[PDB]
């Protein structure tokens, strides 16, 4: 497992060291690949570089990226997915989760809004309290 959705802006426990940022998109590496020049890029950013200028040159060295020497940085991929980020339920939840299981935490996190197990119930509810809306507070017992 241990994947993340790169579109989200995460708030990291410790400040994101630049060695874990892509050399082109500058975001946190998603499926990092290293090139022969010693630089890391997201997977969709290497191909994006490949679509342009024919020879995808490295944004830093300007060294020409020889596709035989490009490889998946599966070790760097693991160090990134083990970085700790604060939970999306910003103040309520105190959980420091790893990025690779961020999406799995929200599926169980008390304070992420669970819309109600009802016909209609446009009530705004938290996971902690939805059993407490089936309790007496929702409009069905």
């Amino acid at each position: 497992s241990l994947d993340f959705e790169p579109s989200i802006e995460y708030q990291f426990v410790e400040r994101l060291e630049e060695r874990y940022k892509c050399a082109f998109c500058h975001s946190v590496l998603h499926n990092p690949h290293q090139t022969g020049c010693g630089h890391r890029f997201c997977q969709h950013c290497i191909l994006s570089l490949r679509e342009l200028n024919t020879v995808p040159i490295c944004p830093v060295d300007k060294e020409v990226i020889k596709s035989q020497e490009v490889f998946k940085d599966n070790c760097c991929k693991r160090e990134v997915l083990n970085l700790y980020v604060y939970c999306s339920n910003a103040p309520g939840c105190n959980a420091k989760v790893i990025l690779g299981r961020y999406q799995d935490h929200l599926q169980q996190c008390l304070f992420q809004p669970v819309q109600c197990s009802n016909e209609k119930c446009r009530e705004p509810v938290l996971r902690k309290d939805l059993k407490e809306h089936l309790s007496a507070s929702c409009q069905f017992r």
Binding site: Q34, K72, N74, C75
Partner: protein, 107 residues
């Protein structure tokens, strides 16, 4: 044989740059498809002696699958070390260590 760097880094070397075979800073570091770094010399000796496996996770591994990890090789050589000579307090980046020892006072 050739194992790793024996030089005492100025801050401690981080685990991620330590060779699981020789327990030293990676020398001409290479990475495996399962995502583990070794020295080039250490890992191919193990391939020759132990077989086609990654010693950390027993995943299949052949010599050609190794790619050089030039990102770590740069960071490691950028790490600052002490010159091991008796009485010398010179700290330099690891890449300059033999530059200093060539004309180091205490030798």
């Amino acid at each position: 044989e050739i194992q790793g760097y024996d030089v005492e880094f100025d801050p401690p070397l981080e685990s991620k740059y330590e060779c699981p075979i020789c327990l030293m800073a990676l020398r001409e570091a290479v990475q495996t498809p399962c995502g583990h770094r070794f020295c080039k010399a250490c890992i191919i000796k193990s391939i020759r002696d132990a077989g086609h496996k990654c010693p950390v996770d027993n995943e299949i591994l052949l010599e050609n699958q190794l790619f050089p990890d030039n990102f770590a090789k740069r960071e490691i050589l950028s790490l600052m070390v002490k010159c091991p000579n008796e009485g010398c307090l010179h700290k330099m980046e690891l890449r300059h260590l033999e530059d200093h020892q060539a004309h180091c006072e205490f030798a």
